[PDB]
Design a binder for this molecule. Structure first.
Ligand code: GDP
Lengths: 179, 342
């Protein structure tokens, strides 16, 4: 609550981010690696949304992030449109080992156009980049696609942490630019 | 953050207790829920109408792209159907329609309604035969077996549509409660007090608890619309959610591999070979894929992906996840508490 001897941390910005993309691509693992620095190989289905909090320092400012993971099965997705309310940035995730998840990126972009604010920021993430022998989605194809939309693109691994912090830092930098 | 781990204990505790409380209250919900008020009906109709307009605008923005436009039209048709169902309730609240039971006699509550009819319709019942027809037109059909059959079909269609409407009404009511929770959660997240931040997480648990009720209704709706079917523990078809362990598409099968059910298309099967598993079309086998590492890898990958689409009912899934999450947490705690001692 705050005394002179134990003060709660303040923040200069509070951004709401949503993770979307096919079930199984690693949205929850990205969330947990970034927010808690944990990882498990064991899959657990979602029955609804989740959020985590993490505060970062960027450009001399303190940014609190509330990061929401969306649900997977249609029966658990009734009020998806409500989670976009107040969202500053959407991170669209595919799985570099799964061509279908990449092809579906266009459907996820449609959901953003349908539900998000007009000024929302976007980032494309190709996850599971540690699975080198199982990769099927070509970097240059994905980079060209992101470039055609004017959005940033990173390949990540929630398992090894590759580019996980960078992804969120990049999204926060893009949002801050328009504040 | 060790303390985050230590806290997860009660956190998981609170989460699964909340989930189980909502699952147990489901049956009572069906009978005791509060009806939507007109204001609630209007709020949902406004929201769906705005969504409809947005989809229309996106279709224009994507003109020419048959595939994208078709996708947008599927969504738009879905929203149009929800709006028409809400319009029935609105009509009932304004007297343009009235609720009747199976004999065509008026009832007060949507709960007790079999059909909602307008002033130009009537219901005729005789010893378990049910007819819906234009008001005053019995003589036109009474000696015409084909026309009586049409009237019986019309009764059944209207009855089926109102059943859809009743489930959707409960969904909308719960949805509005959940949307209010999200505002309070945002207020709590704004706080720098970690105690308020923790309260937001507790409120999320109640939010997802209501989502479990939505999920059961969505499964009931899917089965009602003949998109999906319920199955018991042995994979035998059943009619009621109460007897179901699984729910899957009409185009799918419960495929038994190693004593576990995998939901795959009827035209697919799974092959086991020396510890590897391949999702294949019915006409393929080891002989047909042995010459193609590409086919093998894709089929293995496609089998691996099946875990992301469970066929379990909501209640069974929640129990399954509880076990898994608890086990992972206990493992982490055990390692933290003990490993350093050696
Ligand atoms: N090798 C590897 N596996 C991952 C990675 N991220 C996720 N996974 C695995 O892929 C599965 C699906 O991840 P999950 O976060 O639950 O997917 P979600 O449905 O998008 O939330 C999980 O069981 C993970 O164990 C990664 O970066 N590398």
């Amino acid at each position: 609550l705050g005394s002179m001897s134990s003060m709660n941390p303040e923040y200069d910005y509070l951004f709401k981010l949503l993770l979307i993309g096919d079930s199984g691509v690693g949205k929850n693992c990205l969330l947990l690696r970034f927010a808690d620095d944990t990882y498990t190989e064991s899959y657990i289905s979602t029955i609804g949304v989740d959020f985590k909090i993490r505060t970062i320092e960027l450009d001399g400012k303190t940014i609190k992030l509330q990061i929401w993971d969306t649900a997977g099965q249609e029966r658990f997705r009734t009020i998806t449109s409500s989670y976009y309310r107040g969202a500053h940035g959407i991170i669209v995730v595919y799985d570099v080992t799964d061509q279908e998840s990449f092809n579906n990126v266009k459907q996820w972009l449609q959901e953003i156009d349908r539900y998000a604010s007009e000024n929302v920021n976007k980032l494309l993430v190709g996850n599971k980049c540690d699975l080198t022998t199982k990769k099927v989605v070509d970097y240059t194809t994905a980079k060209e696609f992101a470039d055609s939309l004017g959005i940033p693109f990173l390949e990540t691994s929630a398992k090894n942490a590759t580019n996980v912090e960078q992804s969120f830092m990049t999204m926060a930098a893009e949002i801050k630019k328009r504040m | 953050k060790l303390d985050k781990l230590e806290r997860q204990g009660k956190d998981l505790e609170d989460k699964y207790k909340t989930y189980e409380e909502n699952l147990e209250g489901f049956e009572k919900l069906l009978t005791d829920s509060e009806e939507l008020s007109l204001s609630e009906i209007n709020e949902k109709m406004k929201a769906f109408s705005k969504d409809s307009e947005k989809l229309t605008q996106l279709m224009e923005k994507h003109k020419g792209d048959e595939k994208t436009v078709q996708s947008l039209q599927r969504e738009h048709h879905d929203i149009k159907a929800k709006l028409a169902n809400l319009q029935v309730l609105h009509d009932a609240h304004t007297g343009k329609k009235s609720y009747v039971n199976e004999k065509g006699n008026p009832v007060s509550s949507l709960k007790d309604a079999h059909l909602a009819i307008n002033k130009d319709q009537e219901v005729v019942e005789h010893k378990g035969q049910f007819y819906l027809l234009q008001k005053g037109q019995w003589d036109a059909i009474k000696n015409d077996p084909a026309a009586l059959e049409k009237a019986q079909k019309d009764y059944s269609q209207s009855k089926h549509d109102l059943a859809t409407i009743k489930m959707e009404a409960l969904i909308h009511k719960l949805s509005l409660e959940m949307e209010k929770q999200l505002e309070t959660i945002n207020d709590l997240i704004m706080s720098t007090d970690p105690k308020e931040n923790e309260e937001a997480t507790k409120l999320l648990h109640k939010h997802n608890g209501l989502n479990l009720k939505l999920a059961n209704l969505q499964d009931m709706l899917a089965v009602h619309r003949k998109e999906k079917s319920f199955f018991n523990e042995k994979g035998e078809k059943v009619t009621s959610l109460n007897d179901a362990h699984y729910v899957i598409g009409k185009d799918q099968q419960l495929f038994n591999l190693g004593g576990k059910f995998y939901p795959i298309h009827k035209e697919q099967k799974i092959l086991e070979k020396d510890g590897k598993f391949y999702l294949l079309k019915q006409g393929e086998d080891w002989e047909s894929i042995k010459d193609s590492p590409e086919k093998q890898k894709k089929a293995e990958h496609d089998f691996h992906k099946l875990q992301y689409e469970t066929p379990m009912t909501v209640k069974k899934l929640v129990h399954h996840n509880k076990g898994l999450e608890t086990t992972i947490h206990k493992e982490r705690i055990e390692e933290l508490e003990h490993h350093h001692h050696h």
